[PDB]
Write a protein that binds this ligand. Structure first.
Ligand SMILES: O=C(O)CCCCN(Cc1ccc([N+](=O)[O-])cc1)CP(=O)(O)O
Lengths: 217, 218
């Protein structure tokens, strides 16, 4: 079988710059009839995927000339010169001629901006939730850049894995940052068995982790 | 105009079945191969399989993820394409798309049809105030929020002070928890404006006919 590798997962760019996306294969996908069925599609947020380039370098009618596909045998490239707002979304290379027939992992075109540390805020369980027998501790890690971030939960100083659910926002249309929310959900019983609750974040903006905690007492 | 229309989406029962259709018009149906793809909310687009044209005998190919469990078929007299999904799983919750394929590859796609595989029943969410601890250093700005827990189906709407607070707001994508959805939202205001000025999250869950205004009390 042929292995397809689309890179990168994420592609930060500035408006006006060119972007290059890569689709490579573990072996040749040229068909005996001479064609190479390597296609490129764009899927904008909340939209159906749309064709951009077919058979490696054929730009579909209606696609701006800024877009172009190239490549050969095992290595393929989608180039976008002078990137504009309309181009933001997820690009996928695709081939359905060799097993596994498939789309690539996707490349999300995003906007480049200055590094920004997150604003971390932790919140204890409300009396309303407690009365219902549950205890959720919430931590927001807001407006950071770049998107990569790590969060650790600790109860009484020991790391906690069970019961943690996380959510992430799409890049902010206005300030180009990212935000994250993590919630540690415990029973009232377990919550009332411990005192220290910590949400700790590590981001490329600092070697020191951001630590936010609260004590039940 | 070349047209592909998916339909049949809805809530599916785990272990059940569901047949999606893709009605076409505007071109010669039998000349084309047809593809089915799906995109789970918060996940990548995924290829499911295709059915070839008349010249190729309408044979089929499937992804390893669904081979033997989904069936792709086509009614050549009606110009309709089907996706028979058997023994539904939660991983099948996604927006499904059909697309023809030919010399111009997948040049025309349908608008998609959404499927959600769950045994849950409509359930209002519990709305909880998120206020900073008694012991927590002062700041220039203060962040508050609301945890909207355990509802079904999607979605819920969250505003702050009736949309009066729009800037500095982050409503996070919902996640599945205990077979129900949970979401949170954050709002950031200057520290001098609160608690002197009330901050309330207005959460609406139309399916259960609920609207909750939760005030963030210190
Ligand atoms: O038969 C032709 O001349 C066109 C197809 C050329 C080979 N194809 C390439 C091919 C066909 C279908 C797709 N698609 O996504 O639907 C992609 C690539 C494979 P097969 O012979 O049908 O197995």
């Amino acid at each position: 079988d042929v292995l397809m590798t689309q890179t990168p997962l994420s592609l930060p760019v500035s408006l006006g710059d060119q972007a290059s996306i890569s689709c490579r294969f573990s072996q040749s996908i040229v068909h005996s009839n001479g064609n190479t069925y390597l296609e490129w599609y764009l899927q904008k947020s909340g939209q159906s995927p749309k064709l951009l380039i077919y058979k490696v370098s054929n730009r579909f009618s209606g696609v701006p000339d800024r877009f172009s596909g190239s490549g050969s045998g095992t290595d393929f490239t989608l180039k976008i010169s002078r990137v504009e707002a309309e181009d933001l979304g997820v690009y996928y290379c695709f081939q359905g001629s060799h097993v596994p027939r498939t789309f690539g992992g996707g490349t999300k075109l995003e906007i480049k901006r200055a590094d920004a540390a997150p604003t971390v805020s932790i919140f204890p369980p409300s009396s309303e939730q407690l009365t219902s027998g549950g205890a959720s501790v919430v931590c927001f890690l807001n407006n950071f850049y770049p998107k990569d971030i790590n969060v650790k939960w600790k109860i009484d100083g020991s790391e906690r894995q069970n019961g943690v659910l996380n959510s992430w926002t799409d890049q902010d249309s206005k300030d180009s940052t990212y935000s994250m929310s993590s919630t540690l959900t415990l029973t009232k019983d377990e919550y009332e068995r411990h005192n220290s609750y910590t949400c700790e974040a590590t981001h490329k903006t600092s070697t020191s982790p951001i630590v936010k905690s609260f004590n039940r007492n | 105009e070349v047209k592909l229309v998916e339909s049949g989406g809805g809530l599916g029962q785990p272990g059940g079945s569901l047949r999606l259709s893709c009605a076409t018009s505007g071109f010669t149906f039998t000349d084309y191969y047809f593809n089915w793809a799906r995109q789970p909310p918060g996940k990548a687009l995924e290829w499911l399989g295709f059915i070839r044209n008349k010249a190729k005998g309408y044979t089929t190919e499937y992804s390893a993820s669904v081979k033997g469990r989904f069936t792709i078929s086509r009614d050549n007299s009606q110009g309709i394409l089907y996706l028979q999904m058997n023994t539904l799983r939660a991983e099948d919750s996604a927006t499904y798309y059909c697309a023809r394929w030919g010399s111009y590859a997948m040049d025309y796609w349908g608008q998609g049809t959404s499927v959600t595989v769950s045994s849950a029943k409509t359930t209002p969410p519990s709305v909880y105030p998120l206020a900073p601890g008694s012991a927590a250093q002062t700041n220039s700005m203060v962040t508050l929020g609301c945890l909207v827990k355990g509802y079904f189906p999607e979605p819920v709407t969250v505003t702050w002070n009736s949309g009066s607070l729009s800037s500095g707001v982050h409503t996070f994508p919902a996640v599945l928890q205990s077979d129900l959805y949970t979401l949170s939202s954050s709002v950031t205001v200057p520290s001098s404006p609160r608690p002197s000025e009330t901050v309330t999250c207005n959460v609406a869950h139309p399916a259960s006919s609920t609207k909750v205004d939760k005030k963030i009390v210190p």
